[PDB]
Amino acid sequence: TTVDFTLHKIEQTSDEQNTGHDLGLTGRKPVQGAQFKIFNVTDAFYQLLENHDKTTAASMISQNLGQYVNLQDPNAATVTTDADGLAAFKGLAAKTNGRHSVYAFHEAVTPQPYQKAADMIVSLPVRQDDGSDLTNIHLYPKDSLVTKNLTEINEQAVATKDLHDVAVGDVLTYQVQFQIPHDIGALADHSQDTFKYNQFKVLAYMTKEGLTFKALTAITVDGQDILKALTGKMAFMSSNDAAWQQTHNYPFGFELDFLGGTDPDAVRNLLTQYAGKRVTVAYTGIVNEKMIPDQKVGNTAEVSFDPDSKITVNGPEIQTGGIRFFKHEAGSSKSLANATFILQRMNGNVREYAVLEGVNGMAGTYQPTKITWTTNQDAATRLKTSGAETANLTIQGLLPGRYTLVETAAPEGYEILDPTTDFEVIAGTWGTKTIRIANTPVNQL
């Protein structure tokens, strides 16, 4: 007599069981391209069963399957999940050497950006509220999705999306969610003293200049803050440290390893308490003067447990606005230096004026570290034009929206023509055109 195993590979995004029956239209998301191997573990299971009870025997095999079977086995039948997450092992022996057969299921390959489902075993038979046994046994393995996201801007929450308009000086809270393996505390297969896992590296980075690393806000799992307990027992590094430029050359980022630090055994035990559960690693970065327009910068995140393999996920991109002006003489393209402006906006029937930080010495181009807005007009930063050729006043790090450039003082020898120049900042770009501004020469005597 024979038996079938239908697998229903599903996505997991939270903390979470196999009745053996079909659960029908569950309304959950499938996972295609996950290879599972099958192993008959009957003999090895029953040899364990002499000393240990059934739950203990199963636990023992769940961790360290490669101890009890050969995982790199050509003989072992492999099945890959299809577009609906379906995969079936057909035609297995319901009994093996006089006992009801016990089969194990190892996820051999696990697609991006998913962590593997636990190694599960099934001891036959599975029976119902009438004593009849199943012929086809439905299993619902769970691949935990690795995510990355931008969650807060200046400590305020924001609607999740793939492209965020920022302002220079903004603090951006990013997050990386991922699973703690169910076999984290396990020892290596065929080893008494060495551990299975000896690396648990999370590596976030931008390949472009926009951000500057601030901090590592929190680490949370099961609604518990871990970081406070963790810090000093794990290897940590940001792009602010000189160690970063040796191992990487990414402009921004950080690399945390739980099992790469001073006290890896201590952490492994803590990690085991929440084994299987999903952690979240929050970190902040600040938008610097090197964040420019016509630029979309995301970060990536590389979760890994060895140098050989890694799970890579991408978060949302960020861009910021800029604008150029060309202050000229009326009826020519002669550049006019030392024309004085201030930047204005409305804030609901109320006028505000821009104050720029980190802006001294700068004349033509302005590349501030922050911008704030005051109703006291005399406190606004007075902008000066250069003698530059195609554009002699540029400003960056603005949010998209509507502004007004207000000429406070014309350059000497000239009178103001258009005192108030209304203009729109376009999302993530320098804008449609460089905005020309004429000035009338007064032929003085």
Author numbering: 37 to 52, 55 to 483
What does the article say, verbatim?
So-called major pilins polymerize head-to-tail into the pilus backbone, with ancillary pilins added at the tip (adhesin) and base (anchor). The L. rhamnosus GG genome also carries the genes for another pilus operon called spaFED9.
To study the effect of lysine and catalytic glutamate or aspartate on isopeptide bond formation and structural stability, alanine-substituted mutants were prepared. X-ray diffraction data were collected for two mutant proteins (D242A in the M-domain and K365A in the C-domain), and though no isopeptide bonds were present in each, their overall tertiary structures remain unchanged. Functionally, the K–N isopeptide bond probably brings stability to the M-domain by covalently connecting the two β-sheets of the CnaA fold.
